[PDB]
Symmetry: D2
Subunit: 126 residues, 4 copies
Amino acid sequence: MHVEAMISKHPQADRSLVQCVEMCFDCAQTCAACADACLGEDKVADLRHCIRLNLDCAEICVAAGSIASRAAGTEESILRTMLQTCAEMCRMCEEECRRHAGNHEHCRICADVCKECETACRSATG
Amino acid sequence: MHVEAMISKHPQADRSLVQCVEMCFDCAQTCAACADACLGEDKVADLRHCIRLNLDCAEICVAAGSIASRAAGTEESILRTMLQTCAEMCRMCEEECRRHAGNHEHCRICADVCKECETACRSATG
Amino acid sequence: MHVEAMISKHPQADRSLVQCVEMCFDCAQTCAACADACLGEDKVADLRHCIRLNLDCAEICVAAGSIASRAAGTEESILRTMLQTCAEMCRMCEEECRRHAGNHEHCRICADVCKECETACRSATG
Amino acid sequence: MHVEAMISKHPQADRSLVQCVEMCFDCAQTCAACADACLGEDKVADLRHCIRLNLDCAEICVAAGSIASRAAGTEESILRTMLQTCAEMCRMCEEECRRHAGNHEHCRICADVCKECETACRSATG
Ligand SMILES: [Cu+]
Ligand SMILES: [Cu+]
Ligand SMILES: [Cu+]
Ligand SMILES: [Cu+]
Ligand SMILES: [Cu+]
Ligand SMILES: [Cu+]
Ligand SMILES: [Cu+]
Ligand SMILES: [Cu+]
Ligand SMILES: [Cu+]
Ligand SMILES: [Cu+]
Ligand SMILES: [Cu+]
Ligand SMILES: [Cu+]
Ligand SMILES: [Cu+]
Ligand SMILES: [Cu+]
Ligand SMILES: [Cu+]
Ligand SMILES: [Cu+]
Ligand SMILES: [Cu+]
Ligand SMILES: [Cu+]
Ligand SMILES: [Cu+]
Ligand SMILES: [Cu+]
Ligand SMILES: [Cu+]
Ligand SMILES: [Cu+]
Ligand SMILES: [Cu+]
Ligand SMILES: [Cu+]
Ligand SMILES: [Cu+]
Ligand SMILES: [Cu+]
Ligand SMILES: [Cu+]
Ligand SMILES: [Cu+]
Ligand SMILES: [Cu+]
Ligand SMILES: [Cu+]
Ligand SMILES: [Cu+]
Ligand SMILES: [Cu+]
Ligand SMILES: [Cu+]
Ligand SMILES: [Cu+]
Ligand SMILES: [Cu+]
Ligand SMILES: [Cu+]
Ligand SMILES: [Cu+]
Ligand SMILES: [Cu+]
Ligand SMILES: [Cu+]
Ligand SMILES: [Cu+]
Ligand SMILES: [Cu+]
Ligand SMILES: [Cu+]
Ligand SMILES: [Cu+]
Ligand SMILES: [Cu+]
Ligand SMILES: [Cu+]
Ligand SMILES: [Cu+]
Ligand SMILES: [Cu+]
Ligand SMILES: [Cu+]
Ligand SMILES: [Cu+]
Ligand SMILES: [Cu+]
Ligand SMILES: [Cu+]
Ligand SMILES: [Cu+]
Ligand SMILES: [Cu+]
Ligand SMILES: [Cu+]
Ligand SMILES: [Cu+]
Ligand SMILES: [Cu+]
Ligand SMILES: [Cu+]
Ligand SMILES: [Cu+]
Ligand SMILES: [Cu+]
Ligand SMILES: [Cu+]
Ligand SMILES: [Cu+]
Ligand SMILES: [Cu+]
Ligand SMILES: [Cu+]
Ligand SMILES: [Cu+]
Ligand SMILES: [Cu+]
Ligand SMILES: [Cu+]
Ligand SMILES: [Cu+]
Ligand SMILES: [Cu+]
Ligand code: NA
Ligand code: NA
Ligand code: NA
Ligand code: NA
């Protein structure tokens, strides 16, 4: 990623922020991929809720990542509210993917990414 | 829009919800357009913060609208948290567009849409 | 929607363009809703491909709608290339939803929206 | 990123594809950041077109990345059409950021990312 390089060059220019942005994009992609993997499973009907949460988590993580990419300055921002929502979304999505992780390795990986992204986003709200 | 028609046909199937979804998409488009209009103004340098808020508001309203389009059932959802964030985003974006509304008619229109979308989203959290 | 009102007030300011933008947002929402409806069907395993196409169609229609909301001027743009891609996406998604339309009313509605959006986007490339 | 790990675990499971997805998300973030950096410059009025292209490039790269994250199987997809559009978008955005690269280091970085992402996406269409 180029998060760190771009922050340093912004005319209004944060480790926790870099980590948050990087994780949001990673987690967005991972959850998009996890929704599609679950869709392809023989046991798709068991994975409805998980697919739905991953779609929401992908959507919210792209939004959060994008907003945070614009948060390199002191101006008022939705940033902290958005990161709190994102942390809650990643927590919910982690729990459901974790429940399937013994059965589907894609959900193990995705639960781990959601957990890390939850922590990164919560940490960026401090 | 086809929000109402699609909700009625969902296998797990709400006026406040229909209105929320419709408004989110309307408001997303309007804020995208307002950011671009402000970018094109001779006095663009006066509109930096407004452009930035409109970009965030477009991003959050698409996310909220999409999540709410998937909220026609009783399952656990980020929906209410996301709608609260969206209402806060629309409130912030409304205030800044309103400040420019005397000077730029596009901001008058956009402030009105943000205000309506804020109310719709807050109402859907009840 | 506020597409028409916002275009008229843009400092660099098209019926076919208004119709395209309106349809993209309508179609994005409809396909998001159709993916979720299909996910909830008892016969979800029969709807894998349809769910996947609707997710792509929602993503591409939001992108197209957003880009077109920024296309009220004479500057170089990806607009026409993006609208061509969107028309092709809506054509593909229409065909699959149409195949399920006898069985699922949500797919009938969604196929009709995709068809209309395909035509609107193709017409805006002229 | 977790692109490679998730592809390997998909029930329907490509170096060029992994590289494409990774680059799309990297490039999306970079262009979002470049739009915001340009918005913050004293000389913002000189950067209108560049800001606008970066907003389009961010939108198209997220869309492409997401669609490509769902392209780990042999089913019909918009993928190749979408990647061609994305390559064209990155080419356009590269050219404009490159023009500002001597003046703004953020545009140098962003032009380099767009160039790499253009190549990755074009290569994934083979
Ligand atoms: Cu995340
Ligand atoms: Cu994720
Ligand atoms: Cu999954
Ligand atoms: Cu899953
Ligand atoms: Cu997830
Ligand atoms: Cu997420
Ligand atoms: Cu998150
Ligand atoms: Cu997050
Ligand atoms: Cu999950
Ligand atoms: Cu899962
Ligand atoms: Cu999984
Ligand atoms: Cu999962
Ligand atoms: Cu996950
Ligand atoms: Cu997951
Ligand atoms: Cu996440
Ligand atoms: Cu997640
Ligand atoms: Cu996160
Ligand atoms: Cu809204
Ligand atoms: Cu709005
Ligand atoms: Cu504006
Ligand atoms: Cu503005
Ligand atoms: Cu706004
Ligand atoms: Cu908004
Ligand atoms: Cu909102
Ligand atoms: Cu909202
Ligand atoms: Cu605003
Ligand atoms: Cu404004
Ligand atoms: Cu305005
Ligand atoms: Cu405005
Ligand atoms: Cu507004
Ligand atoms: Cu506005
Ligand atoms: Cu709004
Ligand atoms: Cu708004
Ligand atoms: Cu709203
Ligand atoms: Cu469309
Ligand atoms: Cu659609
Ligand atoms: Cu459907
Ligand atoms: Cu379907
Ligand atoms: Cu569709
Ligand atoms: Cu579409
Ligand atoms: Cu389309
Ligand atoms: Cu379209
Ligand atoms: Cu379809
Ligand atoms: Cu369908
Ligand atoms: Cu359907
Ligand atoms: Cu359908
Ligand atoms: Cu459709
Ligand atoms: Cu459909
Ligand atoms: Cu469509
Ligand atoms: Cu469609
Ligand atoms: Cu269309
Ligand atoms: Cu890209
Ligand atoms: Cu980029
Ligand atoms: Cu820039
Ligand atoms: Cu620029
Ligand atoms: Cu760019
Ligand atoms: Cu791009
Ligand atoms: Cu691209
Ligand atoms: Cu690309
Ligand atoms: Cu660029
Ligand atoms: Cu630039
Ligand atoms: Cu730049
Ligand atoms: Cu740039
Ligand atoms: Cu770039
Ligand atoms: Cu750039
Ligand atoms: Cu790019
Ligand atoms: Cu780019
Ligand atoms: Cu690329
Ligand atoms: Na900012
Ligand atoms: Na739902
Ligand atoms: Na434009
Ligand atoms: Na696929």
